[PDB]
């Protein structure tokens with residue numbers, strides 16, 4: 001998550017209808033990667049820059065991290 | 078109006094009885110002290126000079142009671 | 155004029171009873187041969203498919219008596235129909251408290267089997283004294299006709 | 308089961324819950340005119356049901372954490 005627009009659906013219970021199931025509300029939402037570029041975060045300047053500059057990827061090809069430099073993030077051990 | 082189930086129970090032979098409601102504890106008493114006159118029951122179906130049939134359970138009881146009639150037990154004759 | 159203390163005694167559970175002076179040995183007899191129908195008492199407070207509560211001592215007795223009504227024991231049919239009426243009343247009095255036998259069987263020691271044992275002990279003495287269940291509607295269908303709930307089949 | 312069709316107590320009727328009814332988001336306002344997206348989370352914690360999760364590098368320093376709680380939000 002990175003906004004209220006995508007958050008909203010789960011915050012509602014509407015996401016779950018797309019999967020042929022009744023509405024399933026969440027009691028809130030959680031933010032991690034998003035806040036990294038907050039000016040009151042210690043994330044270095046050019047770092048925060050390079051963070052934004054990562055072109056995200058949809059839930060579609062998220063698993064592609066395991067094999068490729070998908071978006072701006074890769075997976076590593 | 079007046080029916081009271083009295084059972085003569087022993088080992089493997091029983092006899093059922095019909096008693097007036099009124100005279101049911103006099104008949105309970107004679108039955109009670111009479112089932113002590115007999116020796117510990119035998120599941121081998123007989124004892125020497127103790128009951129052998131159901132015809133003997135009643136016969137033994139008839140003489141038991143008739144003895145306590147001629148016995149000097151007053152107020153209960 | 156007519157009061158006679160009848161006790162249903164067993165292991166660690168008892169039930170007291172009020173009987174007409176007249177019909178007190180018919181009720182003593184059904185009680186007597188009924189306390190032999192049960193297996194040797196258990197001070198461990200339960201046996202498998204034997205009494206589990208005091209609600210089961212009366213239930214087991216209601217079906218015991220109601221069975222000897224429909225059983226071919228003659229000359230003694232009028233008197234058994236009376237022991238029956240008393241146990242039925244004493245049961246709907248204290249145990250069911252007006253409520254149906256099913257929702258009051260739903261609160262006894264769970265074997266998922268003895269909960270059935272009480273519910274049939276009832277409709278055995280219910281029909282052995284010829285009474286047809288009073289047309290109540292459940293809190294469910296009541297609130298269904300009161301359009302709170304929509305019941306499908 | 309069976310006994311749920313023949314009961315006389317008023318409490319004897321059950322309603323299967325719709326999580327939308329039970330856990331659906333809501334809005335509410337304070338005696339000083341704040342607005343809170345009402346959820347089990349926000350009502351528990353006592354703040355907006357949006358929360359910054361604890362993250363080693365960035366969520367470690369006492370600034371970002373106390374500054375984010377001063378901004379009225381739940382952070383780890």
Ligand SMILES: Cc1cc2nc3c(=O)[nH]c(=O)nc-3n(C[C@H](O)[C@H](O)[C@H](O)COP(=O)(O)O)c2cc1C
Pocket residue numbers: 001030031032033034360361362363364365
């Ligand atoms: C730099 C970084 C450090 C993290 N440290 C922790 C941690 O110490 N304990 C934990 O339970 N999750 C940790 N997480 C993951 C988050 O708690 C959270 O579950 C996740 O980041 C949310 O996914 P998102 O980044 O796509 O919003 C960390 C994530 C990042 C990017």
